Point group: C3
């Protein structure tokens, strides 16, 4: 009841360019007023599985979105599958889909939805991870809170890189960050 | 309660160069022997609001200080105002000023005040944040524990940058870190 | 549950990198349910890695500290870290008995598998950057890896490396925080 997660195995659960082309591992732990998060990505097939910027010069980034409703439940237009997201039960998930998780949503006062007033950057956290664990293959992970339309809350992970990679598999090291909770 | 904060709104609470020229958003959450911290800065007026180093080549850094007494109560000569620094209640604060928060202070044995004993670097944490959320606009945030004089405990944030920015507004992305607690 | 397992915050040598007790590893693990919040720093006080000079010794560029654990989450004598002051917390010191069980502090074996011939994925690694002497122009990379050592049930390995050419620099670092998925 204190941890929402994807389960840490290697089974594809996410759709970037084609159905089930990747495995997003994401763990959210409630430490009262802040949520502690840990994330990593493995692309298993399709367009982003093996990066070759000599063959495809413009393939330099992609986005994974998690959209939630007023009760903190995952919406189906998210890249991550609904069957794969729930409160932790041992090393798996609970049997039935959860009904409420408002205490895990990014705080709307710290991070407001888009509008006409001035937009601040505190709703963004930047980090860097490394492809295949290699020190010379960095890629940036930019995480933004509550900026998508069609939902009450959102968490989006944008992955991007500036080097010209030649035949590199897109599977990453892990990164931790935290954010202020709604309740 | 488990959380000491500045509240998540954006009304000025801090004085860097002139009265209430900025909003420091700082959340301290107690997870046992460690404190989980989340910080961000928005400057709204004065000398550090808009940076132009072609015009003022020497404005390259500034500091924000938090000084506390033996009970963990904030001293009035801190750059952060005493008005809204308090334990959390919803998206605001408890009605009455707290009188004890020793469990939130940086540990004096891990981070000792200046003496003639050898000074170690472990009382420092470095992080990089981005102005306006732009990937090409980094600034470094250096956090130091218990090195100020005239107080039993202290937390100081130093912000600096090496690039020659032209009309860049100082408002940052968020950074998360942690430190060992006194009790 | 919400306990702290640590090395104590003093500065008394407690770890062996190149010679006996040449360093002080300060490591604090706190349990927050299913994740462990970690905080680490290092002070080397003697030996080969105490004062770095890559003008006279260009090849001295990295070193490794390993913490090996058995099935109950107890530290094994062959770790670089000494068993004497690695224990649960009490005030600014430790409880009076060497611990029993700490499986709730061990890195998750499904998330981070032991070596085998199955594909090895990079998620069992966390990279961080720290600074020597607190100086902004002296970085070093700290690479942390989970469960990749043999001869144990679990492990946490810290590899320290640097690419700058240092000249007579003392290896004592700022602190870094990371987290990992707990076994239970
Ligand atoms: Zn393949
Ligand atoms: Zn402005
Ligand atoms: Zn020394």
């Amino acid at each position: 009841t204190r941890t929402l997660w994807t389960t840490p195995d290697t089974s594809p659960n996410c759709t970037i360019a084609q159905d089930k082309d990747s495995k997003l591992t994401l763990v959210l732990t409630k430490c009262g007023s802040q949520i502690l998060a840990n994330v990593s990505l493995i692309v298993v097939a399709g367009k982003y599985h093996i990066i070759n910027n000599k063959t495809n010069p413009k393939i330099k980034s992609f986005t994974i979105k998690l959209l939630f409703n007023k009760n903190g439940v995952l919406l189906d237009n998210s890249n991550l599958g609904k069957a794969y997201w729930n409160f932790r039960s041992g090393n798996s998930n609970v049997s039935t889909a959860y009904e409420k998780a408002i205490g895990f949503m990014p705080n709307l006062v710290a991070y407001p939805k888009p509008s006409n007033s001035k937009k601040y950057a505190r709703d963004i956290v930047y980090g860097t991870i490394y492809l295949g664990g290699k020190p010379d293959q960095p890629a940036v992970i930019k995480t933004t809170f509550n900026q998508e339309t069609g939902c009450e809350y959102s968490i989006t992970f944008n992955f991007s890189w500036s080097k010209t990679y030649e035949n590199v598999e897109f599977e990453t090291t892990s990164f931790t960050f935290s954010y202020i909770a709604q309740e």
